[PDB]
Amino acid sequence: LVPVYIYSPEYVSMCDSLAKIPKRASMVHSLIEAYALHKQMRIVKPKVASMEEMATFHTDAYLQHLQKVSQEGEYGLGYDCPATEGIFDYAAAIGEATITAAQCLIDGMCKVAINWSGGWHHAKKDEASGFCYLNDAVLGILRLRRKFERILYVDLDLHHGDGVEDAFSFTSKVMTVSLHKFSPGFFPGTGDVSDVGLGKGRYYSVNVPIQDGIQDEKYYQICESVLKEVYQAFNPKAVVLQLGADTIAGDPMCSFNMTPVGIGKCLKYILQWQLATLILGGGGYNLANTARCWTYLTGVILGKTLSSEIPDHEFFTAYGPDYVLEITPSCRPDRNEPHRIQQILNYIKGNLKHVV
Ligand SMILES: CC(/C=C/C(=O)NO)=C\[C@@H](C)C(=O)c1ccc(N(C)C)cc1
Ligand SMILES: [K+]
Ligand SMILES: [K+]
Ligand SMILES: [Zn+2]
């Protein structure tokens, strides 16, 4: 009944080296450790990544070139995803880490496994996209697929989980549900409510297009409404949960207006299903707030109430000016007109009626 926490001093050090999120992995672990939460979780070292376990989703052709430019140095290797040194080994490390957590859920080692450094949901099978070179979420889903008949992927990141959805857009055995911001010109541009999948996978993709400024209460009523209908029609045997923290107030994305407590409500509702759940991180570019969020969420999984005051640790100075765990919503409008939100939920309710 004890959650597995994918951790390794070398692993965090590798994730620290990630270009867009310096030392973020350490900030998260350090803060989690500062609350002594790791003393209540089964700490598991991530396995070593092989080329063969990455090839279960990504093409050989893409994997060769990705490792090649990683040695020294098309395929989406530009813009947000520039070819940099050791990017293969970093991407593969996280890819393997998520697979390790998926493996633990299979062995019946636990009901919940955690890899906060994962959740890179934009990578296609043969294309790098949106800081994502390898798609660890997919790899984990494929691993869970060996034991569990139906997999449910819930993406609570600010951005649409296009990579994971595209990977399983033709199957009914893996259902993806993504709550994200949707507005012309906003990355990645896909994920409208009309996006329901293709082939036999039709109606087994769910996207919830949301506008700026949404807060906890409204977000949960939206999220729970959908998840109630999804769990009813799909009856999942396992869940992969992506909890990107770029939805939290104070994030440089300045889009949604969420607090960790809001996301926690969504997490509490999913955990109450008593299914094998794989918890993933993702976005979150306010490094301190991202640490605040996932630490609180770790406590939510553990069913513990955390002290409001941030304890002193290596990154204590980065938690000004209040040095508390809570996060206050920004005083800016919620751009979600109640009518449109209602129209979307009906569009989804209708789509879910097709699920047998
Ligand atoms: C890819 C992404 C988030 C992905 C994510 O979070 N996936 O989960 C965000 C991009 C669009 C972005 O917003 C951006 C902003 C500034 C910038 N420069 C100032 C260079 C470069 C990129
Ligand atoms: K999302
Ligand atoms: K699907
Ligand atoms: Zn994001």
Swiss-Prot record:
**Effect of mutating D80L:** Complete loss of catalytical activity
User: Which organism's genome codes for this protein?
Assistant: Homo sapiens (Human)
Q: Which CDD domains match?
A: HDAC8
Q: Which residues carry this modification: Phosphoserine?
A: S26
Cofactors that this protein relies on: a divalent metal cation
Q: What does this protein do?
A: Histone deacetylase that catalyzes the deacetylation of lysine residues on the N-terminal part of the core histones (H2A, H2B, H3 and H4). Histone deacetylation gives a tag for epigenetic repression and plays an important role in transcriptional regulation, cell cycle progression and developmental events. Histone deacetylases act via the formation of large multiprotein complexes. Also involved in the deacetylation of cohesin complex protein SMC3 regulating release of cohesin complexes from chromatin. May play a role in smooth muscle cell contractility.
Q: Which disease is it linked to?
A: Cornelia de Lange syndrome 5: A form of Cornelia de Lange syndrome, a clinically heterogeneous developmental disorder associated with malformations affecting multiple systems. It is characterized by facial dysmorphisms, abnormal hands and feet, growth delay, cognitive retardation, hirsutism, gastroesophageal dysfunction and cardiac, ophthalmologic and genitourinary anomalies.
What tissue specificity is annotated for this entry? Answer: Weakly expressed in most tissues. Expressed at higher level in heart, brain, kidney and pancreas and also in liver, lung, placenta, prostate and kidney.
Query: Which protein family is it in?
Result: Belongs to the histone deacetylase family. HD type 1 subfamily.
Keyword annotations of the record? Chromatin regulator, Chromosome, Cytoplasm, Disease variant, Hydrolase, Intellectual disability, Metal-binding, Nucleus, Obesity, Phosphoprotein, Repressor, Transcription, Transcription regulation
In its keyword annotation, does this UniProt entry include Nucleus?
yes
Query: What Pfam family is a match, any one?
Result: Hist_deacetyl
Q: Where in the cell is it found?
A: Nucleus; Chromosome; Cytoplasm
Q: Which residues form the active site?
A: H122 (proton acceptor)
Q: Which gene encodes it?
A: HDAC8
Which amino acids does the record list as binding substrate?
D80, G130, Y285
GO terms in the biological process aspect are: chromatin organization; heterochromatin formation; mitotic sister chromatid cohesion; negative regulation of protein ubiquitination; negative regulation of transcription by RNA polymerase II; regulation of protein stability; regulation of telomere maintenance
**EC number of the protein:** 3.5.1.98, 3.5.1.-
Identification of the protein by name: Histone deacetylase 8
